[PDB]
Amino acid sequence: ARQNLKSTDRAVQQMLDKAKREGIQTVWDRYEAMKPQCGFGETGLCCRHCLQGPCRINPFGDEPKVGICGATAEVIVARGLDRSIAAGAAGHSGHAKHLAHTLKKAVQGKAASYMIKDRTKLHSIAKRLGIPTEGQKDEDIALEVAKAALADFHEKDTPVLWVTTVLPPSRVKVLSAHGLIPAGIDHEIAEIMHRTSMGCDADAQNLLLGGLRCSLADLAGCYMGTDLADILFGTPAPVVTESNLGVLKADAVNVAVHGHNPVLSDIIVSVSKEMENEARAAGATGINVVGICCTGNEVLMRHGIPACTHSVSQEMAMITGALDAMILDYQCIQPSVATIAECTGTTVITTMEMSKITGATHVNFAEEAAVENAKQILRLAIDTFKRRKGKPVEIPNIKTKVVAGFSTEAIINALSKLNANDPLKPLIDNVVNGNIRGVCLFAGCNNVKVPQDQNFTTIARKLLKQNVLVVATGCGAGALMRHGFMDPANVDELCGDGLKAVLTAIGEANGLGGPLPPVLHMGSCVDNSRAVALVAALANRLGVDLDRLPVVASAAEAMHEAAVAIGTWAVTIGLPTHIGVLPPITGSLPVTQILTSSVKDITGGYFIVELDPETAADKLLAAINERRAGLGLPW
Amino acid sequence: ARQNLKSTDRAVQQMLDKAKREGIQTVWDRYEAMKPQCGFGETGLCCRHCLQGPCRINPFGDEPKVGICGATAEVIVARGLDRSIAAGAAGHSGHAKHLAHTLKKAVQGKAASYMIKDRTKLHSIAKRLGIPTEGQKDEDIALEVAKAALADFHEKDTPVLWVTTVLPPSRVKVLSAHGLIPAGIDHEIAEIMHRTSMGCDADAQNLLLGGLRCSLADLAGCYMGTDLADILFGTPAPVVTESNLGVLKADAVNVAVHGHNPVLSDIIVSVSKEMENEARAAGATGINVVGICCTGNEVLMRHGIPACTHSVSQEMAMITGALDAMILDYQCIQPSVATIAECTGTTVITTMEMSKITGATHVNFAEEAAVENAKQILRLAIDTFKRRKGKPVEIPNIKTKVVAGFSTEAIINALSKLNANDPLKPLIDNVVNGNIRGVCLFAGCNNVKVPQDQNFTTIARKLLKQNVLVVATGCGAGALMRHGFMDPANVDELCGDGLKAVLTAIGEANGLGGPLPPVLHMGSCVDNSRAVALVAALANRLGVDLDRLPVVASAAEAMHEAAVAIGTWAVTIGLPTHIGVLPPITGSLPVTQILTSSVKDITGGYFIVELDPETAADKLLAAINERRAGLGLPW
Numbered sequence A, B: 001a002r003q004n005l006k007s008t009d010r011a012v013q014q015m016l017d018k019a020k021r022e023g024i025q026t027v028w029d030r031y032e033a034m035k036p037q038c039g040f041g042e043t044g045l046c047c048r049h050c051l052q053g054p055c056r057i058n059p060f061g062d063e064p065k066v067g068i069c070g071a072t073a074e075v076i077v078a079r080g081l082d083r084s085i086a087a088g089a090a091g092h093s094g095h096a097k098h099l100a101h102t103l104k105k106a107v108q109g110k111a112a113s114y115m116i117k118d119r120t121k122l123h124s125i126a127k128r129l130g131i132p133t134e135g136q137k138d139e140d141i142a143l144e145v146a147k148a149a150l151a152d153f154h155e156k157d158t159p160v161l162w163v164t165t166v167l168p169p170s171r172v173k174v175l176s177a178h179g180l181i182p183a184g185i186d187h188e189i190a191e192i193m194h195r196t197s198m199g200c201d202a203d204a205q206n207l208l209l210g211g212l213r214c215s216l217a218d219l220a221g222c223y224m225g226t227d228l229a230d231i232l233f234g235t236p237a238p239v240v241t242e243s244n245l246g247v248l249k250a251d252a253v254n255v256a257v258h259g260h261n262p263v264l265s266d267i268i269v270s271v272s273k274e275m276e277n278e279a280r281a282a283g284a285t286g287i288n289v290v291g292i293c294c295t296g297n298e299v300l301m302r303h304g305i306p307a308c309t310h311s312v313s314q315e316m317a318m319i320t321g322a323l324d325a326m327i328l329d330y331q332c333i334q335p336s337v338a339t340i341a342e343c344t345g346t347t348v349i350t351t352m353e354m355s356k357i358t359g360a361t362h363v364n365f366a367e368e369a370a371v372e373n374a375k376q377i378l379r380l381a382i383d384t385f386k387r388r389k390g391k392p393v394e395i396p397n398i399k400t401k402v403v404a405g406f407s408t409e410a411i412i413n414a415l416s417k418l419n420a421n422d423p424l425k426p427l428i429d430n431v432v433n434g435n436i437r438g439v440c441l442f443a444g445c446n447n448v449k450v451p452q453d454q455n456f457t458t459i460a461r462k463l464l465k466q467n468v469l470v471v472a473t474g475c476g477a478g479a480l481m482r483h484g485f486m487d488p489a490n491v492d493e494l495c496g497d498g499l500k501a502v503l504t505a506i507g508e509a510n511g512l513g514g515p516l517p518p519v520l521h522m523g524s525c526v527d528n529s530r531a532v533a534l535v536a537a538l539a540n541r542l543g544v545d546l547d548r549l550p551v552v553a554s555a556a557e558a559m560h561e562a563a564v565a566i567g568t569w570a571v572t573i574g575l576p577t578h579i580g581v582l583p584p585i586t587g588s589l590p591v592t593q594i595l596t597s598s599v600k601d602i603t604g605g606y607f608i609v610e611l612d613p614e615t616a617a618d619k620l621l622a623a624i625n626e627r628r629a630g631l632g633l634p635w
């Protein structure tokens, strides 16, 4: 097979060849077996919301033209999209909610493996929420922050504070005028599921306004998750590590942390260092913890744990034969891992009650027992390492250098070395003088339909040459790190002269004798909220709303419902937002026109649907430059 | 066309002939245009939970055999079912939540059109919840009940009290042992949406246990909705009225209330009597309010408002040409009504912010302005009546007599005339002696796939001849009322000798000089909770759990996600539960075996999937008789 048609990652290509000769089916094989995919589903023109279905509508031609109950294409498309947004928001609800409970347990003395690690962030969040701190114990402040987090999930006397306190007042005012401020996170999720059920909401604009509001519930969960993880585990600062399959070590116990919620995998990291001598007794050099997906991003950002792989290529880590354990929480885990494990020897371990996989070993993680749980898990990994003594492994000797840890606090601190009391001003100065053309956030997944990483790297290369400041999260950050976009040694090759000058000036003032990396890694998918914090801080410093800023987003290879929700809130907060795969909307021209055009008149943002990455880069540059022109800037 | 293949209701048949000659497309025409329906959707073997889809699995044959991410048929089927349960629960969340807010507003002086109408029910609910009443103002008790209702939507120090306080302790204990008690109504809905999103829960048993727990969140919303509606609007007592299209009157202003939440349509009823002379000034005899679906059931149960039609046949009320207005809240409204209105003259009016239909007139109902809103709405109806002066109409002269209003309180009161201080004992006595073989609850919708009412009437006839006490809600009650099953004049024809003797003894002791009707109408779909209250009271009186009682349920023509949720909680509380249409589960034998067999070992209940109604009646009788045998009773 030509493996480069599947993935642009050479380590992935090498493992695809191994999987092929060993007869191990991969995600790419399961995709091929699915073709041709259903065109009703692809276009959004299918409904299964009641037992009179399934209903479908022919995109073109003759009947069927309308659902059995009378639901039009507009209604069917908008209802399906709304449920996808609610599903995305629900994952972020679960992630943030878990962290809120963990913080509450910690400060109540119920979970001594957890603690307040970032006291400053705690007090800053309390202040933003209106919680008094003067003369209060940190534990009581944290109890109040956890209570406020849990309160945002349901209706109360205030709207969702993890929306209204994180966006500029002018933006909150626009959203409120259109009825878009969430009343409660789980409240909005449930209202979406109700209104999209049979015989309820049946007006495309009304449905889509509901979707915008639920996407802000997703934003609140993202921002709440980042806030609470930073309190518990530390706010990221710049770190240096490596990425790709070559971070695996044949002579070590290789343990991947995979999923999203690092609540236990932050603990796995710390415990793994304590069990080094137990690993050495078993014949290993040590325990080598590596990351997959956003749990991997979390521990990369906070501890420099190397990233093994991401998203669509996750099975390939197992194909090496050296992955002794894969420790799972939830979200973005291909359930194929449980069956591949039988072929590769890997011990796959689930840990969360609501996310089990038939055939995997389940360990019932509890914060109250986190260290004990981590030791049980790592001992299974050590046992597995011992079982592969003498077996050959094939780890591609392929890895890149990765500078990461660019939380918004870290970015502001780095800029403060150029201007101590007005840190955003050097960035704004360079936007104004054209050294920085604008900002682009790359976000979201890989998707088996797109050769892995091709859109992220093609678009990023064009933007960087045109002096765009590129930030990235999730598996977009994964794609860019695995292709060298987080290695400062590649600044000369990748970056336009203006951007290079700025990255160099910031780097030299931070004592690096070298530039910042070409792309700034801002963390996990919930950490898209960090990009919101940066952009809102810029808006406040400039006295304008986000829909006037030369800032865009690109979910260039989107897959998960999470990514749909994130793209939708990016639009809702005012950003031009590219999506590089087709969401199921093309079966309705009216819905497509709302999402790509008339929503501009509501929020100032809009979707740019473009599957060709060179064309998408041109459209993103045009959007940036239109914003520059609106501010009276050359472009 | 042979109209009896579409509906067994002769009034519906007559209007189908009119629709045909006038060129007005109906739900049956849109169904025909949809055939053949997609077999992947029919069997449950389709997934659109991420942008790598749509994925499908061939029920039999070759590839595709597995989803792109590795999701098996078991996982795909269970995830789709779970989302349907969550959607059903969300509708009941929205309905109950709305009523909780209405009660709070009323007792805070913010909505003087609303009030505490049933003070006794208020105090009984407060006592069941643990709320003190001694020495407290009714308004403060009601404020506390409304607060407790709203608290059950999110996590707190107690589980959902509208589950744990309404089922016997032994049942709560079984459910708790299996992890099935909901933590919060909207909490469970959101956890379902998370766990069913890509790369999360992927074990069929774990997924389905989550679904059982979310179905109890639906039960809580149902019971909360009935409780609060009874406080606000009165607990039903026996009433006499009529049903079917002949309740429309050519010389009156005909106004249908349609949807679920009678929050405003209870007001419409009261206001309509006040505007009689305005209607007379416009040339009408008066305002004739009639019911459709469960909002219709609500006002039938409390005020004897005649029921025009139900569910699948709702368009036919408009085809008469005499329906001047259709006043909509949410749920079960075919959106085709908005376009048919242009052909029939009817004014279709929406009233709830989250349920609009393109082309309908929207009036923004607010409790604070309910009387004003009702007058605006009824004045549109009067105007419409005037526009049809001189136009012929075709109202089928077909209607039945309906005795209804059998709340659980009403049933207990009726039985108390035979035994004042042990009212359930005469019912139990007659179960023991075989005069009553068991109880069957008919629930749920009609479905265009089934000739309308055919399953409800075929099954009911067989059960009644075998001395089963039949109770009914929703459009199952609608089907039975429209075919004479709520007219005591039909007891001799329909009922076995034992059941007739019991209905007669109760009727004669209630001063009727005649029996209770063949079937007891227990109300709307949320009022399935009343059947739960009756069955739980019987369980408590007998000292056994619900899974030992000779009680079954039949969603004989199910359609809405609501009906899936209700059927699932019927199973979860311990009942054999028939469903007369195919839910999308047959693509997975393991899931089917859980839902129809091994769940017995968890909750004592189980689904009986049977599309042939004669066979379904035999299977329901077998289930009843097995329960009788387990209690040592003849059968």
Ligand code: SF4
Binding pocket: A047, A048, A049, A050, A051, A052, A053, A054, A055, A067, A068, A069, A070, A071, A197, A198, A199
């Ligand atoms: S909700 Fe309408 S369009 Fe969807 S399956 Fe049911 S009848 Fe078909």
Ligand code: SF4
Binding pocket: B047, B048, B049, B050, B051, B052, B053, B054, B055, B067, B068, B069, B070, B071, B197, B198, B199
């Ligand atoms: S979740 Fe899995 S089965 Fe469903 S659409 Fe995505 S890849 Fe296909």
Ligand code: FES
Binding pocket: A038, A039, A040, A041, A042, A046, A047, A054, A056, B038, B041, B046, B054
């Ligand atoms: S007809 Fe294929 S997605 Fe439903």
Ligand code: FES
Binding pocket: A038, A041, A046, A054, B038, B039, B040, B041, B042, B046, B047, B054, B056
């Ligand atoms: S393939 Fe028809 S329901 Fe998806």
